[PDB]
Amino acid sequence: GEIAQTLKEIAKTLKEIAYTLKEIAQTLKG
Amino acid sequence: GEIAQTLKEIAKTLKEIAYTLKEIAQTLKG
Amino acid sequence: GEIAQTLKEIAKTLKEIAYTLKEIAQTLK
Amino acid sequence: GEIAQTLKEIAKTLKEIAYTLKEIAQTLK
Amino acid sequence: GEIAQTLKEIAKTLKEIAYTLKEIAQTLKG
């Protein structure tokens, strides 16, 4: 189903967002 | 219908958010 | 119905988040 | 049901995220 | 099924994102 596929894409993009925020948090502490 | 369309819009906005976070991460590294 | 209304709220809050992140990116640049 | 409840939780967490980003934007400005 | 499980994963990743943003906000206040 189309909805299940779009939700898997949303979940993957959110994992990327969470990882980039961990990089930003570390860069701000040096 | 509307649910499938709104989830595609959510997925598109999340890609924009992921990209702007990668730009912010790069700006903090010069 | 209820599901579609909650998803429209989620979509609207995500547009707000995307815009605030664009503002942050501009301030840092 | 479970799906309606999880979507309400997602909407609520996104309002928190939107607020924290607005606080970050103000700190940087 | 699959959709309920994907939505629980999305909710969990969003709680992590909310936490990391609070850590970033505190670092930016020193």
Author numbering:
A (entry chain E), B (entry chain B), E (entry chain A): 1 to 30
C (entry chain C), D (entry chain D): 1 to 29
Anything the authors wrote about it?
Our hypothesis was that these should direct larger and smaller oligomers, respectively. Encouragingly, the new Thr@g sequences consistently scored best as pentamers: for the a = d = Ile variant the pentameric assembly was favoured outright; while the a = Leu, d = Ile variant scored equally well as pentamer or hexamer. We determined X-ray protein crystal structures for all Gly@g and Thr@g variants. As predicted, the Thr@g peptides formed parallel pentamers. Summarizing these data, Type-2 CC peptides with sequence repeats LppIApZ and Z = Thr, Ser, or Ala, form pentameric, hexameric, and heptameric αHBs, respectively. The average distance increases from 8.0 ± 0.1 Å in the Gly@g nonamer to 10.4 ± 0.1 Å in the Thr@g pentamer.
